[PDB]
Amino acid sequence: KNVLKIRRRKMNHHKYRKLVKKTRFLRRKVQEGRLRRKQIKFEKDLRRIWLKAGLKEAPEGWQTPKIYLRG
Amino acid sequence: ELMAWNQAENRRLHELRIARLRQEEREQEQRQALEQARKAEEVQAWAQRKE
Amino acid sequence: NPWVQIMMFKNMTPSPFLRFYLDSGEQVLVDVETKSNKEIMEHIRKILGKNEETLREE
Amino acid sequence: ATLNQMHRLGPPKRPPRKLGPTEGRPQLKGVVLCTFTRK
Amino acid sequence: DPPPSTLLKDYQNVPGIEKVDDVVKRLLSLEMANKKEMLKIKQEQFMKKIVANPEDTRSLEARIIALSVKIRSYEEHLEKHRKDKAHKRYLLMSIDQRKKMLKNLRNTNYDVFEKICWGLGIEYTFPPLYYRRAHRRFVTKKALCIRVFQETQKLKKRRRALKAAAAAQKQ
Amino acid sequence: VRSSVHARWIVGKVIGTKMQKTAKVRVTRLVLDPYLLKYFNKRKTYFAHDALQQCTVGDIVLLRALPVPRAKHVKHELAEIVFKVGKVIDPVTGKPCAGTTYLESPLSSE
RNA sequence: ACCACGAUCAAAAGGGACAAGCAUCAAGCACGCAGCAAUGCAGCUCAAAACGCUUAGCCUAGCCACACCCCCACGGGAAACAGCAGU
Numbered sequence A: 001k002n003v004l005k006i007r008r009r010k011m012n013h014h015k016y017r018k019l020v021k022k023t024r025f026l027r028r029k030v031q032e033g034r035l036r037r038k039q040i041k042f043e044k045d046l047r048r049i050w051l052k053a054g055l056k057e058a059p060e061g062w063q064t065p066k067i068y069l070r071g
Numbered sequence B: 001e002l003m004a005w006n007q008a009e010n011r012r013l014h015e016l017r018i019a020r021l022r023q024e025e026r027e028q029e030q031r032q033a034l035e036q037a038r039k040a041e042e043v044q045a046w047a048q049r050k051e
Numbered sequence C: 001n002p003w004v005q006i007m008m009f010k011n012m013t014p015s016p017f018l019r020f021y022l023d024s025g026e027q028v029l030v031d032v033e034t035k036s037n038k039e040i041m042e043h044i045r046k047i048l049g050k051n052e053e054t055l056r057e058e
Numbered sequence D: 001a002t003l004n005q006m007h008r009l010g011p012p013k014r015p016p017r018k019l020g021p022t023e024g025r026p027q028l029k030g031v032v033l034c035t036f037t038r039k
Numbered sequence E: 001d002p003p004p005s006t007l008l009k010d011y012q013n014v015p016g017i018e019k020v021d022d023v024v025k026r027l028l029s030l031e032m033a034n035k036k037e038m039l040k041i042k043q044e045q046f047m048k049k050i051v052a053n054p055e056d057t058r059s060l061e062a063r064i065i066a067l068s069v070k071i072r073s074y075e076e077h078l079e080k081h082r083k084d085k086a087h088k089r090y091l092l093m094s095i096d097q098r099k100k101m102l103k104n105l106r107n108t109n110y111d112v113f114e115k116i117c118w119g120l121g122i123e124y125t126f127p128p129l130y131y132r133r134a135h136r137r138f139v140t141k142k143a144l145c146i147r148v149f150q151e152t153q154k155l156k157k158r159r160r161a162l163k164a165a166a167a168a169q170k171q
Numbered sequence F: 001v002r003s004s005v006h007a008r009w010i011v012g013k014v015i016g017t018k019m020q021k022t023a024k025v026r027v028t029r030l031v032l033d034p035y036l037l038k039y040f041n042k043r044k045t046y047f048a049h050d051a052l053q054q055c056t057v058g059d060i061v062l063l064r065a066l067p068v069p070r071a072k073h074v075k076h077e078l079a080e081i082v083f084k085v086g087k088v089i090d091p092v093t094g095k096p097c098a099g100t101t102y103l104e105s106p107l108s109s110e
Numbered sequence G: 001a002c003c004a005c006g007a008u009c010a011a012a013a014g015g016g017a018c019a020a021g022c023a024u025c026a027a028g029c030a031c032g033c034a035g036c037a038a039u040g041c042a043g044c045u046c047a048a049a050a051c052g053c054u055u056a057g058c059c060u061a062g063c064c065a066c067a068c069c070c071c072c073a074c075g076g077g078a079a080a081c082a083g084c085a086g087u
Ligand SMILES: NC(=O)c1ccc[n+]([C@@H]2O[C@H](COP(=O)([O-])OP(=O)(O)OC[C@H]3O[C@@H](n4cnc5c(N)ncnc54)[C@H](O)[C@@H]3O)[C@@H](O)[C@H]2O)c1
Pocket: E129, E130, E131, E132, E133, G047
């Protein structure tokens, strides 16, 4: 058979890889900011829980971990 | 009256079941007799080969 | 009989049987081994089904 | 699909209908900003 | 494991095997055989210890015992061969097949199911109701929600004593 | 004889025994699929009071409605264990069975 | 009329049932049980779709909801045609 459908996908993937290459430093700064907000959004969800349960502070000895950092 | 008739229908079917099971034991015993005979020869043959 | 619970059980016993639970608390055991499906339907109609008169009235 | 599969998914769901440029309305009032010709 | 001096399952019931030379006893023992021969002795030991009819090999009990011996052999194999993915697969499949057998034995013959579990040292476990990844966000939140519950319970008990104390003072 | 509970008699399978004196029972009913006109099982959970804690996960039980619910979710009591898990007694013969095989022959007691 | 120790009608309460789309909303976070109580146990819901977001008055002899807004209406904002005619 022909390979015209494969060729369309080939070009799409090539241009995508080429776009990612050109903007890989901007995309890295954007990804970092998203992970920071993701961590903040997670921290708020846990604070909402203990606050809606009647507690005024986090459970004694509880520290919310950083679950989105590369480390 | 219908519950009593249903209990009587169950007893009738039970008598047929006991008759059916007795005829199956006689057949089971015949088969079980041959298998033991065959199984005994195969053991004696296997025992003689090992001896 | 949309409001009657019907539950099926496979291979739990050596022979097939129907059991009905009545509001009084009585239980009706119907042995169905060796019976055709048409005989089972006619049996349970006789012992626990409304007769044609009771249905005509309704 | 099997009957069990058709049961699980249920009746086919139509895609929500897209509203055109009139936003599902027969006519709209407008104020002319500019006139021109198109090829 | 059975002692190495144990005779093979085939030669254990031949007449006069106890009067042969010691050399002949070594050649018909487990010491001079492959591991598969030692597993046949283990299976026979479990069959006589557990099942009612040790000669019924097609019963659900015998299959669980036979498969349990294979499972132990795979575990011993993988103890020495930890990167053997082929045998790691056979072990996990065999464990799953035994659980399916135990489920069907528990449903049909509970008295025999109990003797199989005692005899083979199996702790039957019911499967989890849901299969879903416990990722970091869920694991952390579930831990926090349990700590919040534990703290709320303590505070609710310190609101019982103060109310109790004040009520007594009125008297 | 009156009760405020809707389901007066229901049979189900015990799926939980972790509550004190309470068995969690899965009850299945047949429901007609209006489009396919085929009946499919619809399952509902009922809590049943089990005073003697005699219920085992997997046994078929008969539940009777209580006159009034004894708890938020406990509206029924254990009336009868129909099929004890792995210890079924054949109702037609009264003999113990393991699946489709008899453990004691009906011919033993004639 | 009066009571029916009833009938009719019909609240509150208890049980059951009850829209659509989205699973890129997949976990909810106290949502259970036992006990006269004290208190004890750690459970409860959920891919057979919980929790959640969005859309919509509905199952039309009619029904539900609302009645300027703050779900409510002591209080507050404020000064009300979603009664008819009318602007
Ligand atoms: N999700 C469960 O944990 C679960 C539990 C019991 C039965 N099932 C059955 O699994 C099938 C898939 O259900 P779906 O389409 O809603 O899920 P899905 O395929 O959309 O997967 C969603 C979640 O269910 C899990 N899952 C997927 N297939 C499963 C399977 N065969 N058995 C168990 N878990 C599975 C996935 O790992 C994921 O956590 C259905 O037949 C369902 O009845 C699923």
